[PDB]
């Protein structure tokens, strides 16, 4: 099988998202006690870069940075690991960092519905039995698969948003799992193409009456109309506790390398307090 390619891997969405899920998988590991990795929407596992790309614009700009703040480190290394040659062949994307960083106690349960896809990702994790990989609706995976056994986990909720209604089968979503697993870690991502559309989703989370609920944000441009995604951010319920400070330390600075044109901001807020 051949690798996907994707025009967009590496972008600075990409380096937000993979930044965090790294930075709450060596935080879940300080404990020597197995948790899961659940991947709603695992993608195609890796993505060959170039034949060109928005990778040149995001982890271009930060893996071979000499000041990399230690809260990249992780991250940084899965990048290398895939990229012996010192030249940036292929992205990670989340099954992959969650495969490298997890420890062989640990399991992942990965969820990917495209056909193009989905042998890709299965391919990933032939040999590796930590791993279930099935083709099926992510949010459906929040119902089925909580709580884990192991009673530790981080669920990543990574959709396309390509149809607006995900806005929607997120909080949903996120509501069925933390039903079932109220302790669990869930990091969602979305992207900002209209601003009012992220405004609907992050009410409905806050009409779940869920608490402890972080907003991360970095933006490359202003809210436009009709210019595209200007921004994306990783909403996670139950950040382990010193997620917020590392991303107060590292994202000023994935900042100024990732928009060194200085347009956009980069927050870390509460939309619920705890
Ligand atoms: N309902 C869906 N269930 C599972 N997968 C889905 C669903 N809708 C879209 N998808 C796929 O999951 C991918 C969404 N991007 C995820 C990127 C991945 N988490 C990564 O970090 O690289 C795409 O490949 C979609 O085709």
Excluded: C
């Amino acid at each position: 099988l051949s690798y996907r390619h994707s025009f967009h891997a590496g972008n600075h969405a990409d380096v937000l998202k993979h930044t965090v899920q790294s930075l709450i998988i060596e935080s879940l590991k300080e404990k020597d006690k197995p948790f899961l990795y659940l991947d709603t929407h695992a993608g195609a596992g890796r993505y060959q870069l170039g034949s060109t790309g928005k990778y040149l614009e995001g982890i271009a700009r930060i893996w071979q940075q000499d000041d990399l703040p230690a809260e990249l480190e992780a991250y940084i290394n899965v990048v290398k690991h895939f990229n012996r040659s010192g030249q940036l062949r292929y992205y990670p994307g989340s099954p992959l960092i969650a495969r490298q960083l997890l420890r062989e106690q640990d399991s992942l349960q990965l969820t990917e519905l495209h056909p193009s896809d989905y042998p890709l990702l299965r391919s990933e994790f032939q040999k590796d039995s930590r791993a279930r990989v099935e083709k099926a609706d992510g949010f459906q995976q929040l119902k089925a698969k909580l709580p884990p056994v192991s009673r530790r986990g981080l669920i990543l909720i990574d959709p396309p948003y390509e149809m607006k209604t995900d806005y929607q089968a997120v909080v949903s979503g996120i509501a069925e799992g933390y039903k079932r697993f109220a302790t669990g870690t869930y990091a969602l991502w979305y992207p900002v193409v209209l601003r009012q559309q992220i405004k609907r989703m992050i009410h409905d989370l806050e009409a779940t009456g869920i608490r402890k609920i972080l907003q991360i944000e970095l933006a490359v441009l202003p809210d436009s109309d009709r210019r595209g995604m200007t921004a994306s951010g990783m909403i996670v319920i139950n950040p382990p506790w010193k997620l917020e400070q590392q991303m107060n330390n590292v994202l000023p600075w994935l900042h100024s390398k990732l928009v060194p044109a200085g347009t956009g901001h980069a927050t870390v807020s509460w939309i619920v307090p705890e």
